[PDB]
UniProtKB/Swiss-Prot annotation:
This is Lysozyme C. The gene is LYZ. Belongs to the glycosyl hydrolase 22 family. InterPro entries: Glyco_hydro_22 (IPR001916), Glyco_hydro_22_CS (IPR019799), Glyco_hydro_22_lys (IPR000974), Lysozyme-like_dom_sf (IPR023346). Residues 1-129 form the C-type lysozyme domain. It catalyses: Hydrolysis of (1->4)-beta-linkages between N-acetylmuramic acid and N-acetyl-D-glucosamine residues in a peptidoglycan and between N-acetyl-D-glucosamine residues in chitodextrins. Substrate binds at D101. Monomer. GO terms for biological process: cell wall macromolecule catabolic process; defense response to bacterium; defense response to Gram-negative bacterium; defense response to Gram-positive bacterium; killing of cells of another organism. Keywords: Allergen, Antimicrobial, Bacteriolytic enzyme, Disulfide bond, Glycosidase, Hydrolase, Secreted, Signal. The active site is at E35, D52. Lysozymes have primarily a bacteriolytic function; those in tissues and body fluids are associated with the monocyte-macrophage system and enhance the activity of immunoagents. Has bacteriolytic activity against M.luteus. The keyword Hydrolase applies.
Amino acid sequence: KVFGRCELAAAMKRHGLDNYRGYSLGNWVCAAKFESNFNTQATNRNTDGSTDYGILQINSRWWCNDGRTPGSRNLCNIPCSALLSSDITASVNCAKKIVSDGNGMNAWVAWRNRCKGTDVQAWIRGCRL
Ligand SMILES: [Cl-]
Ligand SMILES: [Cl-]
Ligand SMILES: [Cl-]
Ligand SMILES: [Cl-]
Ligand SMILES: [Cl-]
Ligand SMILES: [Cl-]
Ligand SMILES: [Cl-]
Ligand SMILES: [Cl-]
Ligand code: NA
Ligand SMILES: [Ru+3]
Ligand SMILES: [Ru+3]
Ligand SMILES: [Ru+3]
Ligand SMILES: [Ru+3]
Ligand SMILES: [Ru+3]
Ligand SMILES: [Ru+3]
Ligand SMILES: [Ru+3]
Ligand SMILES: [Ru+3]
C-alpha cells in the first residue's frame, strides 16, 4: 500500500507514534517518506547482505527474520515479510523497539540525513489529526 502523507500521519498516531520516545509525529512521517516513499512494500538490499523492509525500512541484520541474513538476529520476533503489510502494526511495533535502543531515531540514517533538525511539523501540516 502507498499511503498518503496525512493518511500515514493519522495511522501512525493511531498506532502510538505521536511523540513516542519524544519524537513528534512529523519526525516519523518524514522518516517514512525518505525511507520508503510511503510504500509498505518497499524492500532494498544492503551491501552487507541484509535487506530493509517496509515503510520504515527495518533491517534483517537485527530486527526481523528473512532466512537469508547470516549471523543475524530477529529482535522484533517477526518475519520480515510482516513489515510489508498494508497494516502498519508490525512496523510500528518494531520501530518502537528500534527507537528505544539507544540512539533514538539516528538508527534511521535517512532520518538523520534528511529529517533531523528540519521543520518536520511540515509533514503533518494541513492534516486532520
Ligand atoms: Cl487500526
Ligand atoms: Cl507530535
Ligand atoms: Cl511534528
Ligand atoms: Cl537469517
Ligand atoms: Cl520468521
Ligand atoms: Cl494500520
Ligand atoms: Cl532520543
Ligand atoms: Cl511547518
Ligand atoms: Na534477521
Ligand atoms: Ru502531536
Ligand atoms: Ru497529537
Ligand atoms: Ru536502512
Ligand atoms: Ru540493542
Ligand atoms: Ru542494538
Ligand atoms: Ru513550520
Ligand atoms: Ru486523531
Ligand atoms: Ru485530535
